[PDB]
Curated annotation (Swiss-Prot):
Disulfide bonds join 255-290. This is Endothiapepsin. Keywords: Aspartyl protease, Disulfide bond, Hydrolase, Protease, Signal, Zymogen. It comes from Cryphonectria parasitica (Chestnut blight fungus). Residues 17-328 form the Peptidase A1 domain. It catalyses: Hydrolysis of proteins with specificity similar to that of pepsin A, prefers hydrophobic residues at P1 and P1', but does not cleave 14-Ala-|-Leu-15 in the B chain of insulin or Z-Glu-Tyr. Clots milk.
Length: 330
């Protein structure tokens, strides 16, 4: 079997992408944030604290004839950006673009942190990292991809995120018309539960490629590209007026600047992120200072190849016996 769904930026900056997911019987369509950096499928629901719900679509397990409460199971997650959510668990039928999984654990939220409430366009998350990171206690649950894998034509899913445009998540197949040239595959470590790989280096604009190993995770659930301070300083040094702002929380640059591109290595292959992909607009409404799309990972503890990097490429999340990552230009 296969599945194919359109993914859409939530706003004019591509802060995040949402993909419609059908849950339950009859179907309840919720727009979820597909996240290759986490492994919980959680949704805003009829059980979410009323004051923590602001415009999101909710899952009502009592209205699904296939919904079954998973006895004694609870979940609680805390994300890298400080956000959090928790609740109880149901098992239900979940479909993504024609691909169906019965008995999928659907984590129903009782509490969500303020930033989830503040984002009315994201109805919950669909975790696509390895199931070893799933937070369901006392019995850990599998991801949608893990549950579907054996049924898929090929044990893979692809991320094809658009820059200011719609894109696609495909499951079970590789759309050979969605990229140019060939897909270069690279080794993945699953030790931390992430799609963790090693970039062979980088270049800034038309500058010399620097061969250096950058261990990081392919994360669709993180907006920006988080890289070592040495690499990030080398990037922003090419932008007139750019500086690291302690008050803003990162590198900022004059909104009138035209940003250089950023190339990252995948083996001997190169993915070029165009400069416009690195502009995250004014730091505050009406400001002429803009926020950068490449930021230091010094505070996080891990390098993150978030949407800024991934949207420049066609990305294969290969769930073969030995999982690997594939990248192609497009
Ligand atoms: C991800 C993280 N931080 C940001 C954005 C996206 C977009 C704009 C912005 C403006 C000021 C500070 N941070 C951000």
């Amino acid at each position: 079997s296969t599945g194919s769904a359109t993914t859409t930026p939530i706003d004019s900056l591509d802060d995040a992408y949402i993909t419609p997911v059908q849950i339950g019987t009859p179907a309840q369509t919720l727009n979820l944030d597909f996240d290759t950096g986490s492994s919980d499928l959680w949704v805003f629901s009829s059980e979410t604290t009323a004051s923590e719900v602001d415009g999101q679509t909710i899952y009502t397990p009592s209205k699904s004839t296939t919904a079954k409460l998973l006895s004694g199971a609870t979940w609680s997650i805390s994300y890298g950006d400080g956000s959090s959510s928790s609740g109880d668990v149901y098992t239900d039928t979940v479909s993504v673009g024609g691909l169906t999984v019965t008995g999928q654990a659907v984590e129903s939220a009782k509490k969500v942190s303020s930033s989830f409430t503040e984002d009315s366009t994201i109805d919950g998350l669909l975790g696509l990292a390895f199931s070893t990171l799933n937070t369901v206690s006392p019995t850990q649950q599998k991801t949608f991809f893990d549950n579907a894998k054996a049924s898929l034509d090929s044990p893979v899913f692809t991320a094809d995120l658009g820059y200011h445009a719609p894109g696609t998540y495909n499951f079970g197949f590789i759309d050979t018309t969605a990229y140019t040239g060939s897909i270069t595959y690279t080794a993945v470590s699953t030790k931390q539960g992430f799609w963790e790989w090693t970039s062979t280096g980088y270049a800034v604009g038309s500058g010399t490629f620097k061969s250096t190993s950058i261990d990081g995770i392919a994360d669709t659930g993180t907006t920006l590209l988080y890289l070592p301070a040495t690499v990030v300083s080398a990037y922003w040094a090419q932008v007139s007026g750019a500086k690291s702002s302690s008050s803003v929380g990162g590198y900022v640059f004059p909104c009138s600047a035209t940003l250089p591109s950023f190339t990252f290595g995948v083996g001997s292959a190169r993915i070029v992120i165009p400069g416009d992909y690195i502009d995250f607009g004014p730091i505050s409404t009406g400001s002429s200072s803009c926020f950068g799309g490449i930021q230091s990972s010094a505070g996080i503890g891990i390098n993150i190849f978030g949407d800024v990097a991934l949207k420049a490429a066609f990305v294969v999340f290969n769930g073969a016996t030995t999982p690997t990552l594939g990248f192609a230009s497009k």
